[PDB]
Amino acid sequence: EFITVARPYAKAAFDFAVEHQSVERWQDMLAFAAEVTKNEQMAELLSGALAPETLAESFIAVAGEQLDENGQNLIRVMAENGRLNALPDVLEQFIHLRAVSEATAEVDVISAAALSEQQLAKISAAMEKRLSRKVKLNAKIDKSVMAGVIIRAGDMVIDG
Amino acid sequence: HHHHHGMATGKIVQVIGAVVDVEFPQDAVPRVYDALEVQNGNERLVLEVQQQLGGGIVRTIAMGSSDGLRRGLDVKDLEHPIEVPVGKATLGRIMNVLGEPVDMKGEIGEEERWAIHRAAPSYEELSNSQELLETGIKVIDLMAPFAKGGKVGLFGGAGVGKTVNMMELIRNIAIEHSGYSVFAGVGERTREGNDFYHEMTDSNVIDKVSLVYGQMNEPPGNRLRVALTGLTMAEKFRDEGRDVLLFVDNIYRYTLAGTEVSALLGRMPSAVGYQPTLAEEMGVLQERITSTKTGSITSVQAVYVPADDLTDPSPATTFAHLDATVVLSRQIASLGIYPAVDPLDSTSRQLDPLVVGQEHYDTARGVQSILQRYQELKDIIAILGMDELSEEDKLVVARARKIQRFLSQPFFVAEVFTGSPGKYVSLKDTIRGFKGIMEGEYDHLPEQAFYMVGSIEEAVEKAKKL
Amino acid sequence: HHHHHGMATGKIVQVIGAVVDVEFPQDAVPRVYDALEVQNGNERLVLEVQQQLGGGIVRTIAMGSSDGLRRGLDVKDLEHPIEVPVGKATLGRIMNVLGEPVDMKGEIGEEERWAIHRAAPSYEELSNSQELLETGIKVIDLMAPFAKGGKVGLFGGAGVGKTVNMMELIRNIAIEHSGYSVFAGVGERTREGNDFYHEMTDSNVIDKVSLVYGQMNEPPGNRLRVALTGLTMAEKFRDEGRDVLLFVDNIYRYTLAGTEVSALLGRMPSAVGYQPTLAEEMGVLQERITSTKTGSITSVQAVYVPADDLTDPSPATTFAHLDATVVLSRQIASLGIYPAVDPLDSTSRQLDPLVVGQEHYDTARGVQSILQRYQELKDIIAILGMDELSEEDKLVVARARKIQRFLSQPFFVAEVFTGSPGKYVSLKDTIRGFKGIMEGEYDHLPEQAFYMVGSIEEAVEKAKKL
Amino acid sequence: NSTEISELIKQRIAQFNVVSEAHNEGTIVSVSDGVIRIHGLADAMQGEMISLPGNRYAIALNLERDSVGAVVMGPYADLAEGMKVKATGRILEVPVGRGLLGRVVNTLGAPIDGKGPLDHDGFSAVEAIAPGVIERQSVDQPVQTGYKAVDSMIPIGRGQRELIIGDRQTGKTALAIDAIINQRDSGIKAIYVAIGQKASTISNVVRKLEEHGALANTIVVVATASESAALQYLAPYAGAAMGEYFRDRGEDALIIYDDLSKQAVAYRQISLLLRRPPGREAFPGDVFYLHSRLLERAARVNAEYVEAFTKGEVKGKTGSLTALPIIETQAGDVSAFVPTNVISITDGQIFLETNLFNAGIRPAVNPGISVSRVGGAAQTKIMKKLSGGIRTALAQYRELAAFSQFASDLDDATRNQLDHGQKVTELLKQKQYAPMSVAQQSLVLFAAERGYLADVELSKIGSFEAALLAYVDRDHAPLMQEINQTGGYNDEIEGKLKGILDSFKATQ
Amino acid sequence: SRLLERAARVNAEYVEAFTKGEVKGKTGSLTALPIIETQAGDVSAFVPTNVISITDGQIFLETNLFNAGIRPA
Amino acid sequence: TGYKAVDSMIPIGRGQRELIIGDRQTGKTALAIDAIINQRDSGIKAIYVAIGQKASTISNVVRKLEEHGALAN
Ligand SMILES: Nc1ncnc2c1ncn2[C@@H]1O[C@H](COP(=O)(O)OP(=O)(O)OP(=O)(O)O)[C@@H](O)[C@H]1O
Ligand SMILES: Nc1ncnc2c1ncn2[C@@H]1O[C@H](COP(=O)(O)OP(=O)(O)OP(=O)(O)O)[C@@H](O)[C@H]1O
Ligand SMILES: Nc1ncnc2c1ncn2[C@@H]1O[C@H](COP(=O)(O)OP(=O)(O)O)[C@@H](O)[C@H]1O
């Protein structure tokens, strides 16, 4: 729930902190530390602390303690400054923002999320989406092809 | 002092002048704004936490600001709540702030410090004295009579009229009583300690009264610290003896500091940056100090209004929360009268019919009707002139101008501040002279014969001899 | 409007409204006048950064608009702040608001290209003696001693107009004193430019004045930015050997654009619907038109007050920032005279007092006392009758009517528009003729033959030759 | 890394165990032309000055954690967001010293146009406090204001506190231009704080005020339109820097102030631009500070205050601080918090009427509205005992003559308000550059108080009687100058004034 | 309009009131006196217009009659 | 109530509401207790709502209101 405060944690840790081989520590530390307090015990019991050493050291060093310098420094600075109260977009913002150098994801053809490996425009979407293999799945792929002509002809010709 | 130990409030992290925030542990907060001894830059300064909070960082209230101190200086506090002086031992020396030395002599007072809040009696224990007191003039001693125990609120500050009413009222009221008092004094001028304090401190007048000093060069917390010193000496001296009068003045520091200090502490405003607790402080501070069963407290209030500010909370709160609601209009002082006081604003409770009499009823009815008709006949006698006039314009103008211009006179201190002499009038000539000058008997005098006249001796001798 | 050197900067972020929040460089922000020429749409819309911020998104404000831009417009870095084109060669065509033109081509005479932000007030090398000026008229120079390079205010309604001041001042002041008199304009009409400019073809001033008007079809930042053209273009001629003389239009564009733009940006300012930048712009811009060692910097203070608003900054800034303020009513022009400026309330502080000489003191005292003492003999005496008309009524009425109707000497405004001559009135004839022959000497001039005469020099031969 | 800080975000989010921010320096977070947040500064003092980029004493507002609001002197819009500052030692280091009189002094220090070399005692505190209670006695001494009624009616001594206000476009800044030439020396080094001047005011006031009199004992520090918070709103508070070298030493101290309310708009940035609270025309309680240790410190010292403030130097003398502050009223605009607090914080109040000040009359003082603090206390024997009834002429003549256009006030009794009423009230008025001293009050109050030069004196008789009697009596007798040496009101004043005035005025 | 709406008299058909359900609830009058102590007839706010306009009675006084010399106010 | 015009020219009913606006220092709280001899001596179940009082208001109002005919009514 950072929104505007989510660009600094995802953009500032994928450039200066990427030289120390921290590509796997951010996913396990952010996913484990952010997902470990998603129940009804660590969030209400750790978010209502008085100091930052008890919530940061207990919440970041008592539930597995699978962190190092980035986990203790990021958990202490984020918990003491006010950023560890939610942290729900750390995995999506850190993974999507840190993995922007080789991001290859397409869209959907009125069916299901295929997520093709197309890094550029019309890369692998034509061969992967037109070279069956798979042509129509069970998620209303072939049945949704008549929505354009049926909705366009019926909606555009419904006025008379 | 007497443990006054431990405390340990930590260092100041967010020092924003008077509203500091020293974070510490969980047990580092004052009890209802207790005393403290924080060692900032000078010495052990007090820091009463007016608003408690968690973590130790509370909204403290001190006298001076946080100028010169750093954001890491460790300080401390105190365990006692109130530890000042409250007694009749410090009479010849002025009490500084709480009860230290302000003048040349040192003030000590009583060692047994009581509460820092005034407490009056209940509804069946308040001995309200109904004794009418007369002044040394004619209109002030014959118009309305204030009773003992109650404090007459006088609106209007300095810059137009305050020394004439406070000097003649304080000198005539303090000299024409023959008793004990406990008046203090704060918020005066810079050179008032060598002129005003020299006469009362050198003329054997403050021998049985706990006086105090204080100019207008104090801070925000130092000028508003008169509640503990005034309530402690007034509540302790008013109940430990028989009688203890007072004469409070300079209400500008309490209204400006109390009404302006609430917006700088995090709270919301009220009326153009005013305090939201004016009824509790004005009603509790103005109603919790009256005449009790242990002793009468005939105090004297003086509201300081800025440029005749009669539309704020001082006029509405002081006009109903106190005894009389006097003021200082510019029409009396701008015309060159010998009174310079608004006598047509309000009066006392002994000016009706049963407790008054034929003199006060006939003088109040004739003076009110003649003054209202003559003062209200300007729409037909000012624009049109003397064309459509008759007996009402000459009789109302002569009776209202002669009674209003002859009802003012000096009162010792009011005599040396102008130029005319001072003569003490009586109640028989002033109360009996209204049925002759405003009827047709003593209406043969002119405008020069009624100027600076007492009652009937100065008007009859000056009008018949000159 | 800045010299771009590099063309880098970065992208943008938000673009809601006129707030240019583009993220240019990180730790390489520019100055205040150094605008970033961003490529928004098709044109290079520059935005002046009023307040720089960290990160890249600075608080910038553009003049016009982006003409449809996206959320990530590319910007460009600059080097020289406020690099516009001006100089002393602008007297030839109409100018724009960014150093370009509005009439023909040539960017209002392309010459130099220095900084657009000129210096306001300075001393040392500047002229601190503050010498007086002389326009060369009998009802402008002899009645009001203006200073050399001052901001004289103007009041009144119609009567004179822009053709009389521009035509009469574009030939007498241009030939009697070396200098180029330019003009300005902020908040005009769209049709007046198609008519008033025709007046430039009737007096030959277009080749000696730079018309810099912004009309009113643009916004506040695009039409109120005419201060750099006058100060940047007028400093090249006043600091070289000539004397610049600008002319403002009104104060509705600077007051409405400054108060609305400065108060509608999310920040508090002054009261009564005013902004806090009125003292800096009025005090810094009002003191910049002063005399120097290389030429006097004069400017026609044609500010418009808000219907005589004494509580706002129009009467205080206009009456306290300018010097003399002449008023022109309809009484002097409704009778059929040449000059519409009356002699009442149209003088400076050093024009009627004892800080000039016997000519200005005797002419100002005799003309002011004769006009004020003679103005009531023809208006207040007309309701009764002319039976009680002695030597004061005939001499004061004949001298006041003949001197008032004959003192309006025609300048060079009607010499190339109507056909009447007159050349310019001298100070010896108006100062040595209106104090002796206009009181009670040489009563041979009538009312028809005394009209259209140059001060008192041409009125002597008209009494015996016509 | 919650906030975008690039260096501090990655360094603080990746290595929070090493902060190292106790040097009381660092840099700045942003710079919005004045409102700059100084980053760090944990051990720095709150309110202390610090030299940042350039030459400006940037002082912090408060010590709220590490985000202290620094205010640099001048415009900081051209610099980028990230100015590196230095250490914050201590503030209050203005040029204190009474020995710098004569040279040009500005609001920034001792460098102005054109004499930038002023030797002072040392850079110390400028905002002085008030005096004590028993050690604050007013010294009664005589002085010359500029006219006979001003110096004989309201004689303000050294160390008084009165309020003065002038009419707009009538004479609120000049009027009496013979004060420096007629008063010569004002005790010690003089001062005059002003806000709003240019080349014509400094050149005309410096050339006119310095060409007639002695300008080697006056250190006026005025300001133009390009003034910041320490040069416009802080002009009246920093004017008591050299006073400690004059008032707190044994001698007296002269000071003045012009246009005090005009700088109040400069405080608007502390109420509007700082997002604070507003009151009267968008202004907070900072003006109330002027009633604390600023304008309320104009009081004379006593005998015991000269030995403690000077660390043993006088021991018997009494100091004085004559700081008369004036203001330019907008046609009688004095009904707000500044007029009530400024007029109520002192002990004197004087107002100038705009009826006779703009009609051509020399008498710009109002009748009955002037109520000074001293008046007859600091006057001599010829101004308090013989000329003590100065209010009866203006009050009796104005009140008796302004009776809605009356006929005659008892005929003969109206002679003092119609016939000979203009010879003592309208004729005794100082015009443009008119000096006055003890000869005008002693000669005009010791001879024209009975009927020698006050009965038959009107227009021609009033001008010829005063000119012939003053020229023949002042040029024929030599003992009259002795009346300017002592008090007066004895047999020599009545005999010499009556015999010299009657014998010298009987043959006019 | 909620707490100040108890200024109406009940009838004899009200069986509730106090005792249910015959007597002790017939002619039950409930008078109310809204004598507000204003500042010389100061009535130009939301409480004065809403309270004075939402009720049925209206009365005012003046200080000139009681302060001039008469007994009535 | 207690006057001649309050029972004929301005009479109120049992179970109605009438708003009043007394002037300051004239007939605000003094006219509603001083000129009320019929309402306090006739015997009616009234209820007063006093907000903001002290020793003089409770002593003068209790002694003056209890020393007439109401007291315990
Ligand atoms: N009482 C007076 N009678 C006649 N002339 C006067 C009087 N007082 C001042 N003057 C004239 O005023 C002139 C000085 O004006 P000054 O520069 O003080 O105006 P100002 O104070 O700048 O006006 P403003 O306050 O409107 O800016 C002098 O030349 C003097 O002749
Ligand atoms: N019925 C009446 N007729 C004439 N005069 C009256 C009457 N009732 C009271 N007064 C006058 O009112 C005066 C007392 O006023 P009081 O102090 O009670 O006003 P108050 O209750 O304080 O006003 P407020 O309620 O507005 O504060 C008495 O002097 C008396 O003469
Ligand atoms: N009875 C009176 N007659 C004439 N003048 C008076 C009278 N009382 C006061 N004054 C004038 O009022 C002025 C009050 O001055 P000061 O004490 O400084 O202000 P304040 O009275 O507001 O404190 C005095 O100068 C005095 O001349």
Describe the 3D structure.
Chains B, C: InterPro entries: AAA+_ATPase, ATP-synt_VA_C, ATP_synth_F1_bsu, ATPase_a/bsu_AS, ATPase_alpha/beta_chains, ATPase_F1/V1/A1_a/bsu_N, ATPase_F1/V1/A1_a/bsu_N_sf, ATPase_F1/V1/A1_a/bsu_nucl-bd. Chains B, C: Keywords: ATP synthesis, ATP-binding, Cell inner membrane, Cell membrane, CF(1), Hydrogen ion transport, Ion transport, Membrane, Nucleotide-binding, Translocase, Transport. Chains B, C: Produces ATP from ADP in the presence of a proton gradient across the membrane. The catalytic sites are hosted primarily by the beta subunits. The structure is cut from a larger assembly and holds 1 copy of chain A (160 residues), 2 copies of chain B (466 residues) and 3 copies of chain D. Chain A has 160 residues and is mainly α. Chain A has a domain at 3-101: N-terminal domain of the delta subunit of the F1F0-ATP synthase (Peroxidase, domain 1, Orthogonal Bundle). Chain A is built from 8 helices and no strands. Chain B has 3 domains: 9-81, Thrombin, subunit H; 82-350, Rossmann fold; 351-466, Bovine Mitochondrial F1-atpase, Atp Synthase Beta Chain, Chain D, domain 3 (Bovine Mitochondrial F1-ATPase, ATP Synthase Beta Chain, Chain D, domain3, Orthogonal Bundle). Chain B contains 16 helices and 9 strands. Chain B has helices spanning 139-142, 163-175, 196-202, 220-223, 226-240, 252-260, 278-287, 313-321, 330-335, 358-376, 378-381, 391-406, 413-416, 427-432, 434-437, 457-465, and strands at residues 14-15, 38-39, 44-45, 48-51, 59-61, 95-96, 100-101, 153-154, 325-326. Chain B starts with 13 loop residues before the first strand and ends with a helix. In chain B, 46% of the residues are buried. The termini of chain D are far apart. In chain D, 22% of the residues lie in helices and 9% in strands. Chain D is α/β, with parallel strands linked by helices and 508 residues long. Chain D contains 13 helices and 12 strands. Chains B and D meet through β1 and α6 of B and β5 and α8 of D. β1 of chain E pairs parallel with β1 of chain F, so a sheet runs across the interface.
